[PDB]
């Protein structure tokens, strides 16, 4: 779980093209969801470290703000009816860790199952 929070520092760079990241089982699954939304150009497992590319548009990067909700020292859980109040009138991306794999916040409400808020992408206050 500790290695998951170490990906925000590397992926949050302006003047860079590719950054390394420690190899982890959970980290690989997270990158898949981000690529679908069009946030990561691509990634490759280089053995002990994973090389992840950075996407840019008109100079500025596609990622501008990263918020870590879940931490190794504690665990944030929200009911299906409570996640909607938290996440409303926004374009942000919340990573939800449900029993049936990992999915975004939009899919969590559709199934109505209780997920787990891991991190936030392109989120304001």
């Amino acid at each position: 779980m500790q290695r998951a929070c170490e990906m925000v520092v590397s992926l949050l760079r302006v003047d860079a093209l590719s950054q390394r990241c420690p190899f982890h089982v959970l980290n690989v699954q997270i990158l898949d969801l981000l690529q679908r939304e069009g946030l990561i150009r691509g990634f490759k497992v280089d053995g002990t470290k994973i090389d992840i590319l950075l996407k840019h548009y008109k100079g500025a990067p596609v990622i501008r703000n990263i918020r870590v909700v879940s931490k190794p020292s504690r665990d944030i859980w929200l009911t299906p009816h409570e996640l909607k109040f938290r996440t409303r009138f926004n374009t942000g991306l919340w990573i939800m860790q449900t029993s049936c794999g990992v999915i975004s916040h939009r899919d969590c409400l559709r199934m109505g199952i209780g997920g787990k808020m891991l991190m936030a992408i392109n989120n304001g206050y």
């Binding site: 690989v28 699954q29 029993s99 794999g101 199952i113």
Partner: protein, 63 residues
């Protein structure tokens, strides 16, 4: 009256990693039965049972 919507078949050539592909395939079947299995009265089962089910299975569409 209810209106069950059809669910598309999962794609076999999924580009995701093997760990995520297996989870996604299983989750598709759960959604199909979620909307076709009305739940019983709350009083049937214990309180404890309800809490575990909410965090293990999706929510039915016919309460």
């Amino acid at each position: 009256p209810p209106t069950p919507s059809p669910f598309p078949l999962p794609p076999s050539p999924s580009p995701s990693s093997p760990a995520s592909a297996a989870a996604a395939k299983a989750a598709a079947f759960a959604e199909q039965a979620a909307a076709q299995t009305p739940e019983p009265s709350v009083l049937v089962r214990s309180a404890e049972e309800w809490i575990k089910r909410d965090f293990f299975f999706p929510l039915s569409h016919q309460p």
